[PDB]
Write a structure and sequence with these properties.
The structure is cut from a larger assembly and holds three copies of chain A.
Chain A lengths: L11 H26 L4 H25 L4 H8 L3 H20 L5 H21 L8 H12 L4 H17 L3 H4 L11 H6 L1
Amino acid sequence: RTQTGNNTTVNIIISTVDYLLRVQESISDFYWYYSGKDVIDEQGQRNFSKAIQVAKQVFNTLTEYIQGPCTGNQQSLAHSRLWDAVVGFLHVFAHMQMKLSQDSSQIELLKELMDLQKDMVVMLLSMLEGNVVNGTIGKQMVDMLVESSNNVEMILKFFDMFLKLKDLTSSDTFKEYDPDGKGVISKRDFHKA
Amino acid sequence: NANVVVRLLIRRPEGLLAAMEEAIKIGNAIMTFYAALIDLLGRCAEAIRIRSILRSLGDLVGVISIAFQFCPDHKAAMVLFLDRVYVQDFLLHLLGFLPDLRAAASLTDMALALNRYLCTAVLPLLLFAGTEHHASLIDSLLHTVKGCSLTKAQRDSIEVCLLSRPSMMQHLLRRLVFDVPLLNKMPLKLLTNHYERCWKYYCLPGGASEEELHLSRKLFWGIFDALYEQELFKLALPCLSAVAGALPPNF
Amino acid sequence: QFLRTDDEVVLQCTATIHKEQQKLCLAAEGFGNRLCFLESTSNSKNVPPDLSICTFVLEQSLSVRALQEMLANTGHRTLLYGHAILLRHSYSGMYLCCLSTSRSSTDKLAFDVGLQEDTTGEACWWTIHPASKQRSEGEKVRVGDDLILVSVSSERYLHLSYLHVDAAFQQTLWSVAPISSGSEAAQGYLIGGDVLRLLHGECLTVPSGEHEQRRTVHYEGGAVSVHARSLWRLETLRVAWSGSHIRWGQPFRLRHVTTGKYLSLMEDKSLLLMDKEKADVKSTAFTFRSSKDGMGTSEIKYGDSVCFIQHIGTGLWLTYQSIQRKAIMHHEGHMDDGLNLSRSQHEESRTARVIRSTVFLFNRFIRGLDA
């Protein structure tokens, strides 16, 4: 964070925060490119999966930055500028998930972006522990996460409609509704049930 | 590339049109400099909002000024700018081809510019003044009556006959049948043989007009007895025979 | 601290007249003018600048992708740099557009600056960039950041030419003064810039047409509220947070609506209606008394307010002379010192600026015929 023993201090962590912000802006621009055509092909798939690997690495760095609960790093990154980039990542996430779900070819990139979402919220939980009761860090958490609160509808409906899907699909007029009990159930039959 | 270059010019462009028109009198390098500038600007064509900026930076003043004033490259760059950036009446309003077709036997920098303005006249291919332009084109073609560039000149004259009314077409076809007595040279013979199709398209709409038609029929009958490529001219002379049948339906 | 949807701001340069920082801001009339022009604020004391023809509203702003989507379609949304924005003229409801004409010098094709009806097209969209390496593009837009104004239609720097304003390839920074944001804030609350009446308990009035030449000040009972001559625009001596919540003690200019003139206690004679030049601090502005810098707490209201008024230079108080109840200023006066207020409305103000606009334009037209 500072190199106490050394002369001209440099926070290396604010620098990689700003790097991640640049990464996020370029991911956002990639989304605004593929936001219209919506049939994303192997060039963009491959390069964008590489970018998923980039961000997958760097959120793990951000975990192990503050996984040891040292409060100087907590106050540094709490005071940082990545918080709007967090909102931008969520706006990437929610709007990606729809067209990722609508493709059977994009299931790999969906899995990768889903894993990136997982690493993002793992980092967020890891830094979100150091609250005495409220915390000014907690103030800033809550305030910019309510500022986030427009795209969260999509991911929550996404989660519930993939989850209580399988919570429903073992019932009476579901499982022997097709006689094999495997998943050879037809479209309109499953739809009606 | 030209997008970013033009945006850099909208960062730093560096009354320039008035100062263009002065330094001819004495220095040639700044003239060729602005010519290269406008030629580079002519090499680009959503992005429609900067296609406006192509059209934005008054230009027709410089176009008409260089349309009749060395002489090859500046006017060629202006034609390249104008055709890409910027109907038929304003197209022929520029009469720039009038002094070029007038100086069609001026032999030497213009004698090198002649094949440049052959293919440059191909660029505007896409009522009296129309007769004047047909007269200037027939004057340049008889001056052409360079040969591979003269093929482009012949294609330009073919599209000039394809541009149309038929009254100026007959006015030029009179001179065409007059020069056909001088040949039926072989390029003017093939030019009149191609113009036989446009005369057929005029005479099918029409059916000393029939008098010149009978004179052309008698001259074609004499050229049929005056004797591949000449066979091609004779086979395209049958279009003039169909024109005469639709009628009967360097000086 | 930052900029969001629906923020009342202004744009201003401290322009150089031989390095004299002529603090001139953007002026646009509207409702009769489709052009934008300048307004000097360097003499904020004696010849004070106007407000409503200078304020603008952050309507809507997005990134490149957002803009593309919008063009394809045939809250607060906190501002980030590099974004095309939508500016409404807060008075006239028009929208800032680069006019594609050449009504200046020109000085080849830089283009004109004006207002229009629609939000459509690319002329209503204006990218913002910091001309500072200290701050980034796409990060948050703070209070008072000198920035770049570039359209999406013309894609040119909104340049302060000479006194012209054009879109060209020539940069011009612009100051941002937040005025009333955001929101504005709850009803029944005195926030400066508003036009309102003076409830006597009956109102204040100004003489009618072709009379003075409308410079005296009187009380009146009856339907002078329906008259526009009982209307009074609030005007701050300050610029930043002009649309703060109004508190007592702090003084403010007051300006008559229909003439455009300033409610001016000329200490020699009486309470008069003087012009822009005489509109000094202790000549026309009044300290606002309950006794005989941000949004601000909602100190004073419309329904319940005992508005004692003390003059700056003289200290006199809100009274009258012996309906031609000629309102004057005196050390005590009557027991009619702390009067009541009642707000005007939006369409009323939109008519109201058109009133004296009509006055100026048609009197100039009359005298142009007379010459």
